[PDB]
Amino acid sequence: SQRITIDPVTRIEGHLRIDCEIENGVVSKAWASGTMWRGMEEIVKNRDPRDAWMIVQRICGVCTTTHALSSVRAAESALNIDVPVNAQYIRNIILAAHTTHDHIVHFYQLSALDWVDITSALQADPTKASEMLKGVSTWHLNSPEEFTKVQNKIKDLVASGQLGIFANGYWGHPAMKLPPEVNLIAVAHYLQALECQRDANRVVALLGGKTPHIQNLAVGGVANPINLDGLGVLNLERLMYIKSFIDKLSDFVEQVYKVDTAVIAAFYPEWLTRGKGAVNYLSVPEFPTDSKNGSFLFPGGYIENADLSSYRPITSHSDEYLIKGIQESAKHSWYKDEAPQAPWEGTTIPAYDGWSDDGKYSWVKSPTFYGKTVEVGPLANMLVKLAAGRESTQNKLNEIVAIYQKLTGNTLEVAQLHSTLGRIIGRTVHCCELQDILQNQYSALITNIGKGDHTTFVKPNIPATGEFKGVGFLEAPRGMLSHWMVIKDGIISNYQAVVPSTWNSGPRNFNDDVGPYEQSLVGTPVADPNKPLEVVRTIHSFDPCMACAVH
Template identity: 25%
Template sequence: MATTESTGKRAKGKRARDTQLVDMSWDPITRIVGSLGIYTKIDFKQKEVAECHSTSSIFRGYSIFMKDKDPRDAHFITSRICGICGDNHAACSVYTQNMAFGVRTPPIGEWIMNLGETAEFMFDHNIYQENLVGVDYCEKMVRETNPGVLELAERTEAPHAGEHGYRTIADIMRALNPMEGDFYREALQQSRLTREMFCLMEGRHVHPSTLYPGGVGTHPTVQLFTDYLTRLMRYVEYMKRVVPLHDDLFDFFYEALPGYEKVGQRRILLGCWGSLNNPDHCDYTYANMSHWGRQMYVTPGVIVDGKLVTNDLVDINLGIRILLGSSYYDDWTDHEMFVTRDPLGNPVDRRHPWNQHTIPHPQKRDFDDKYSWVMSPRWFDGSDHLPLDTGGGPIARLWSTALSGLVDIGGYVQATGSSVKINLPRTATLGERTFEWKIPKWSNALERNRARSYFQAYAAAAAIHFVEKGLAEVHAGRTQTWQPFTVPDEAIGVGFHEAVRGVLSHHMVIRDGKIANYHPYPPTPWNGSVRDSYGTPGPYEDAVQNTPIFEENGPDTFKGIDIMRAVRSFDPCLPCGVHMFVGNGRTVRAQHTPTAFGGSA
């Protein structure tokens, strides 16, 4: 952390006042993957963050080197975008290819994909919640940053102690201590179970070997689904402790630190692209996308100020805009438009991903001009370019699903219009349990984290239904997992899915049987976007800017825990582009120095 004190300065857009701002940066942010940097000006007199800039020093090059590739290879290549959620990219790419190739996955293939993707949700949310973001709330961290809060936690009985087994809030915090806490260690064991579940369905983690356009290569048997189910029910039993534990922990912070709801709070601007297709409805055609999108087991939606604007995937698709502003790229105003109208005849904007051209322009970082490799995706509502965020994924998914009220997953999950009810059946030692996620007052750090626990239970409950449907197909003898297809000379496709931490779309244009344009947009560009061409900050920047400071340490020993909680609540992940662009035909050579171990330095 670099610290520089500057006297008598004011943050941009702040009211005039004499103040002393301290420049503080965290670069890279720890406990995430990638090179996210957060640069702030902190007003210690007012105890708030006055200004924030989010940066990424890595370049995403897939939109360049996907050109001229065989479209059938798209999912294999794009799964390498990320070493964490590569399967989400592979699945989304398969959905994109299905549309472009005009092929429909057989039902059992769809159930297998849904089981793989729910296993990924369970795996990733669990390890992030308990082993990464959970450290922000553990006893060691709270002792260093807010000893007064820890003292209160020692005296505070946990309301759901009978369900999760920890008598006080301080006991929960100790259980989250890294490497030592028993709940921290238990979460690692659960992560192994869920990774095994994933590999049963998609072959390997994190770059699947069994996903293809037209279906899957996994061989469906009773044994396959049973092996998955035995692990799943152990996870279901674990979730009956996880949800009440986090309810107790996050509710305590509201009580212990009045005003803590403002940490990481921003205007409610949420996006969810939907997930987990229903094979009874999903034919992957653009003409029917509005219908089959609403039949997804996670309902797509755009939420503005707490209200559902649309749950129509066609509307969502047409509203996507890629803006530049503070990003290290040249504009593509004068370049070719690949798609002027969608398959329904609707006009497509020049700044839509189908028409985007990626023109990198490396340069020195300047917070008054260009300062990051991340572009600025926005959703255009007809008048404003909205900086939607995903809230780390779960809060947007639950909010959208709740408001639409369309989901009923075999009695295991029901959307009510104002909440989502999750019913977990009897397990080895615990009876049935129902949890209800209710739409919160705020989109802030604590509610993003709370939603993550509830969505783990949601994914587990949905997976039980998917196992039942898969077994029914096997018993009926319907075991074809793949449909043949041909690659057209010209086509367009779009896939909508949810990566673990939020919205994921892949847009593809095919010409002469090859990829002419390909643009994947995972949640990181949405959440980690920078000030766009209209000067609107991205979600990380917006959530940190104006966040109050509750940490008890002064500038000399300041850890920035409230800032870190705000940023990490989004589940940041920036490996979606550790690539290098060196121009056309340029060769880079490096001299390797041998080491004592026979390798090179």
């Protein structure tokens, strides 16, 4: 038996340590540890409810927008405010555009170097590389000339002797299976991804006021002033500009990101058979389009024991079954109170005592849904949409499967999606589907303004006595997010965030049950225990964000 530690895990957000026991070259047990805490729940306490969103947005800058939107939703929940529909359209466009940036950066900048060997790209024939894509993609930047320019960029970096962030990589590792040509294609797409994600954040910026960290929200709606005839406000010229960036995203997402996801599956099919983290999945509906905080464009639900046919739909952010099920434990976390807590009654009292295998080992809490461990995020969101019979999701998945079948002769069944590659596929499907959300919500906004509705904000009143409670749900890039606010005498008396990477990365729980990261690693082959690339491949598939997980 051997014990390894990976600390720091890189190409994530934040500070993560992973430990594994390895028996005969197979992981037998794992531990996930968030190693940094700020106490953002305590920082926001005792403030005006209207102020929380600006503070708690700073939980994370990778998933910027998400905590801001969840926080305003939580205050609106507590206060019983119906958000104006134009404010929903604007919030929706921001979240969809943000999530587009986030997923593209995850696939390329964070994850690709687990699966791609840059030094092997130097041996590639750029013309053969381009020929491999004929009839596989219609992307306009897969020419031999593009690939040669990229290859030369790699050659020049290597020749400098200053590899920097590309140094001491896992070049030549036995788990690296792509041919030279495919490694070169992937580097070219990594660089092209950077332009696409920049366009996505231009959308976010024009509505948010900047990114990272948008500044256009309010408890009661948004701060954007809609006036087609106004100078210096959100007028038709500004809306046209937003539209010009929305229109630039689809080709790369569909002709590059979607295709590359199918191809990675084709070359790494064993990764459809490992990295299962849970048997229960949860997602919330997202993108409300009515005047009453509902009519969501994307559905939500709960899947128990992987049974899609008996899933429980969730169609409302006020769903009592959802609300009542959520608790968090700190039995194996560095906090004082250990019994499972509903978040309106939550505490976050630090109690660090160092690493212990069988005791406390993480700043992440352990969330459960009616006492069960649950995986959240794009795998959950995709499975729930398939359980719902959402045709858009079925069709998009089928497009990926078709590319995979062209390359391999094989199909993918739903069982194969409960895996490391399934999780990556779910994320890609999400990014693809989000492009239609953007078109839909831009069109909805233009149409609604045309009917004469320029309303964006409903001013709240906050009773100066009494105690009342609200919860804001959001389907973030990494899964279901919830912010839970208690107001007493007009100020925040409790604030608890239960964040998607909390669900997935949390340590063993009150019943010593294993959470998704830790469970997913059992069975992972490790060719070289000094260089445990296989471990990082599975962890990265969850898109860890530890500032989120811990806050």
